[PDB]
Amino acid sequence: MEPLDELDLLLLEAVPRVELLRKKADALFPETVLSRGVDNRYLVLAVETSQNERGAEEKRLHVTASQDREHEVLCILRNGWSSVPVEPGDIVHLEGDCTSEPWIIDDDFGYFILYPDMMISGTSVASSIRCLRRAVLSETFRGSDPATRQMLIGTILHEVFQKAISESFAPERLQELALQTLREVRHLKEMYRLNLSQDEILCEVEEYLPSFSKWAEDFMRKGPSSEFPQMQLSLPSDGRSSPCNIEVVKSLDIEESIWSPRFGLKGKIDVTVGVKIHRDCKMKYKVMPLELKTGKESNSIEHRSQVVLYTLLSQERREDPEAGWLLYLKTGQMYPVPANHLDKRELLKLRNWLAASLLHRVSRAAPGEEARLSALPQIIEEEKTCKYCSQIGNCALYSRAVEEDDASIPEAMLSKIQEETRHLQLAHLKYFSLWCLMLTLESQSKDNRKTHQSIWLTPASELEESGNCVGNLVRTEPVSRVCDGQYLHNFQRKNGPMPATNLMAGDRIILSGEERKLFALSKGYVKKMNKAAVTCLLDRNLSTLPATTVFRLDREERHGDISTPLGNLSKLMESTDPSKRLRELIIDFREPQFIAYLSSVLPHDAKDTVANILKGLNKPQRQAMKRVLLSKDYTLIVGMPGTGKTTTICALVRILSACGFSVLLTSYTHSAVDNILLKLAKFKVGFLRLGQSHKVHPDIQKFTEEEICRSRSIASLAHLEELYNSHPIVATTCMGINHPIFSRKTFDFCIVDEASQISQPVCLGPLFFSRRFVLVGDHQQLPPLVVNREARALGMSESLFKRLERNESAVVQLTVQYRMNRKIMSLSNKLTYAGKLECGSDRVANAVLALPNLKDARLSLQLYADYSDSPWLAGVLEPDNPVCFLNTDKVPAPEQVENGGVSNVTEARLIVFLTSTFIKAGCSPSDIGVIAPYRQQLRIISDLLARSSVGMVEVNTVDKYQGRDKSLILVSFVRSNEDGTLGELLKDWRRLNVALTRAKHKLILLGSVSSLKRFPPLGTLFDHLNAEQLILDLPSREHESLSHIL
Ligand SMILES: Nc1ncnc2c1ncn2[C@@H]1O[C@H](COP(=O)(O)OP(=O)(O)O)[C@@H](O)[C@H]1O
Ligand code: SF4
């Protein structure tokens, strides 16, 4: 903007601007429908402040509930509402009634719900009264309130009381309930975690119990209504003065789980109760929310506010209860909490700021330029609140790693921040700060930002046709229990039939009812799947309204996955000796040490056993074992394809075991960890498997903590502790580091399988409990998946394995492979592994595809085709031609583009033929893998294969094929285009590599050389394929052979 002239012409003034905001809201809230009435969703278009009275702020909002940009509705926020931080492009909901006419919301009328699909927990909202920062930090570093003793006592009491209210408050029965519940594995675990006495906890819990009885005698007495406790309860309901008499009749519901699209609130109502309010000689009956509190009898604002929010939650399910109850089990003293409009308003205003703070996490600085982490809500001046925070750790830490001549942040706190973060170096802070930034961006990616609107706005049918919304279902079969909050249910349709789609038994599913009034309820996972019925395990028992009730099941999306990574990052920053050690080895790249071999590096007694184990192993394997044994810090085992990383890890574990080391065995997937374990079972090496026995492989389930417990009926801290110390080897996944075992045990060694696939901050986790570690991986194979472009660009896809690989001292390669025949090996060897792979034997080397009856299959195919078009088919089927590229050039084989995805029906039809041929040539479908790069193309190939009713071969992307192999791999590359649209995906070297290494005996590759050559990995492949003349050009679709397929 120089000349007079630019200024002139740079004067704008609506249409691209309005549309750019629709894009803006779609970034964070994809597919927000926009609506009128009860569940209104309005898109903000314009925001300004004005002056009424004199010096009185108003906020002038221009909003729309429709996409046609002439449906503009005006809106004025007054008093405290005017200060809510709405910018344009936000999605809002006016719960202050209306939509009929929004106009004015102020002190005395209306609620404004900023980012309504963002359902924040009321407890976090209450927390933020005192400190908004503390709340945000709570929401995001979820583990930095460690489980205290009181929290344990707290849970136990809540639970006893819930059990009591459905039964009796008679002291012997309360004592019984206390006795039973103190023995539940769940609580034993926590006692274990906290190294507490079982009996001491029992004792402490027992002292509360007479209060339980006093309360029940007071309120649940069944006498004259004169004689119930007497208090003022000023409701909406007309007349609100004069005392009245309170009778709790029954508990109606316990742990009522409520999600509010209306207020952007979620909550769990401890106990829902039937209450009779007695008024002179008349009575009113109200279903009301009661919160149990295990601390001091504070009647704090936090505590009351909580209950106020529970009243709002309630409206999602029933009539507005107007008030709620605080119990304080310590004393048996119930307090009324009335939902005043002032409260409901004050809290919902504060709730907005919380939603804003949790959403406005990455800053541009110039709408388009590189990312920053947005600074959190500022540090308070209330130096008393601070004192006892626990979040102070992360607060000081977030401050120092992301802050700003200034500060002017309280100087009694400015020193605490330094005490807390004096142990850390600049590198460390930089590392923390970046890893958050990356994680946040990843978390905020559009894909993992879908709202629950599908569940509560569009009904059952419209959604079942795809994705997952199975829903016209009733239950009648009695609900079984399993343990605590894992109830087994059984559902099927009204009247008769009805379908399936993408709803595979194992899936995370959310179970709502029919009507909007029964949304949320219970969440869980699927057990089995008939097309007559559906069994799933849930956290809630669901009796309350039988028969009449229709239920919808739906899918899900986390992203708040980022809690675990964030945890590990926070733990890394702690000043403990293990965290220092990891800081230096990881952040500071301190060189790992290895000692030189001596006679007694191993316990004398281990040596025969170790020598035997070694003698089983190929040389680089032995070299690997040596490096681990000589390690002082860590070892990196490179598991090149087919080299037997599962056989190797088992061997290491056997050697370490023989040496009298404790080993923590971890991986990314349950499958991978279980595979190693299955091998170890054979060798009769003992181990305990942590994790959920349904996610654990069938034959390992016997070794599970879950199974062992139920099996051997473990009902004492000592017997649980016995099980925990029963095995030197403990096996879990990288995510399962939250187990109470890691509160109390450390290990000589941690081993991480698939270290190269696991995201770096996740991989970090099990290491905190290990003295020396071993990462197993191959960076030539797939990296951790990083969806967000920008994040990927900052280094987010660098596995911990690769990071540490820059110390070659620590790296040992597994190079002798047992998967590929020399021809198939030769490929990946020339392309990727710089000639380092060798065959495990001549057997492996010379193996060609098992095809028992080519003879009559070659004939049956000539019943339409030709023998004079042997060019390809003969070269394709010939087992002695193990590598083969089929060029879809002289037949046109065009790609089709449909909404983000790519397909190719020519290639699809082509491989489906080839598959059918090879099964008919005697290769079983089980031994066959189909690989395509495009999600969309896989669908087409599955369909076409079902059409040919040969369905037993798997079609998939490389991801779902890592460290598995098939005897015959077939690859449709799908890209085939005029000379334009060029993938990002095919450009990837590693993905190609995985594709070329899944095949044992026959590899078949199919795509258009013309367009494929434009991708470097493919370009180079074509070069090596030309040297051996392995490209075979397909004839025209006209030609006799192809004609009948197309
Ligand atoms: N040192 C070795 N000597 C002989 N065969 C081996 C050796 N290491 C691995 N193998 C073979 O290689 C194959 C691959 O190992 P396996 O653990 O079954 O799957 P993967 O290692 O590919 O996960 C096995 O069938 C195994 O017999
Ligand atoms: S420490 Fe004080 S300021 Fe930092 S979060 Fe906790 S409360 Fe808010």
Q: How far apart are CA 563 and CA 557, in angstroms?
A: 14
Residue 288: in which H helix or E strand, if any? strand 282-291
| Cα angle 520-101-116, degrees, rounded to a multiple of 5 | 30
- Residue 166 and residue 146 in contact, taking contact as beta carbons nearer than 8 Å: no
Q: Does the beta carbon of 617 sit less than 6 angstroms from any atom of ligand 1? A: yes
The CA 183 to ligand 2 mean position distance, Å, reads 37
SS3 for 252? strand
What is the token pair recorded at 593? Answer: 């040490």
User: Residue written as tokens 């407890």?
Assistant: 123
In 450-486, which ranges are E strands? 473-474
Q: Which ligand is nearest to the CA of 781?
A: 1
Measured distance CA(17)–CA(19) in Å, rounded? 5
SS (H, E, C) 683-736: CCCCCEECCCCCCCCCCCHHHEHHHHHHHCCCCCHHHHHHHHHHCCEEEEECCC
Q: Would you list which residues are annotated within the binding site?
A: 131, 386, 389, 395, 639-646
CATH of the domain at 539: 2.40.30.270
Q: Does the Cβ of 840 fall within 6 Å of ligand 1?
A: yes
Structure determined via: X-ray
As a whole number of angstroms, the distance between CA 827 and CA 821 comes to 10
Does ligand 1 lie within 6 Å of residue 433's CB atom?
A: no
Q: What angle do CA 871, 872, 873 make, to 5 degrees?
A: 115
Mode of pairing for the β-strands spanning 634-639 and 896-898: unpaired
Q: Show the ligand 2 pocket: residues with CB < 6 angstroms.
A: 131, 133-134, 137, 379-380, 385-386, 389, 391-392, 395
SS3 label, residue 93: strand
- Alpha-carbon distance of 721 to 725, in angstroms, equals 6
**Which atom of ligand 2 approaches the CA of 377 most closely?**
8
Nearest CA to ligand 2 atom 1: 392
- Of all protein residues, the one whose alpha carbon is nearest to atom 1 of ligand 1 is 617
Amino acid sitting at position 172: E
Contact 94, 42 (CB under 8 A): yes
Could you give the CA distance from residue 353 to residue 342 in angstroms, rounded to a whole number? 17
Residue 181 contacts residue 152 (beta carbons within 8 Å): no
In this structure, the number of other CB atoms found within 10 A of the CB of residue 605 comes to 11
Ligand 2 atom, smallest distance to 380 CA: 3
In 948-1015, where does DSSP find H-type helix? 989-995, 1009-1012
Instruction: Indicate the angle between helix axes 870-877 and 905-920, nearest 10 degrees.
Output: 60
Q: How far, in Å, CA of 90 to CA of 85, rounded?
A: 10
Q: DSSP characters for 195-247?
A: T--HHHHHHHHHHHHHHHHHHHHHHS--S-GGGS-EE----SS----S-EEEE
- Of the candidates 616, 619, 691, the residue with the CA atom closest to the CA atom of residue 654: 616
Nearest to 968 by CA among 935, 939, 925: 925
Give the closest residue to 498 by CA, choosing from 544, 524, 530.
Answer: 530
Biggest CA pair distance of the chain = 104
Place of tokens 């004939």: 859
Assess contact for 667 and 673: CB atoms under 8 A. yes
**Centre of ligand 2 from the C-alpha of residue 383, in Å:** 9
Q: Is 962 in the pocket of ligand 1 (CB under 6 A)?
A: no
Instruction: Tell me the sheet residues that pair with 817.
Output: 839
What range does the domain containing 528 cover?
A: 448-554
How crowded is residue 699: how many other Cβ atoms within 10 Å of its Cβ?
A: 11
Residues with Cβ within 8 Å of residue 99, at least 6 apart in sequence: 36, 37, 40, 65
Cite the annotated binding site for [4Fe-4S] cluster by residue number: 131, 386, 389, 395
* Distance in Å, CA 628 to ligand 1 centroid: 20
Resolution (A): 3.0
Ligand 1 touching residue 667 (CB < 6 A): no
Q: List own/partner pairs for 1032-1035 with CB under 8 A and 24 or more apart.
A: 1032/871, 1032/872, 1032/875, 1032/876, 1032/884, 1032/885, 1032/886, 1032/887, 1033/871, 1033/887, 1033/889, 1033/890, 1034/872, 1034/886, 1034/887, 1034/888, 1034/889, 1034/890, 1034/891, 1035/869, 1035/871, 1035/872, 1035/890, 1035/891
Q: Following DSSP, what letter does each residue of 22-81 receive, concatenated?
A: HHHHHHHSTT---B-GGG-BEEEEEEEEEEETTTEEEEEEEEESSSSTT--EEEEEETTG
Residue 774: DSSP 8-state = E
Q: How far apart are CA 610 and CA 875, in angstroms?
A: 48
What does the alpha-carbon distance between residue 615 and residue 975 come to, in Å, rounded to a whole number?
Answer: 48
Give strand pairing partners of 47.
61
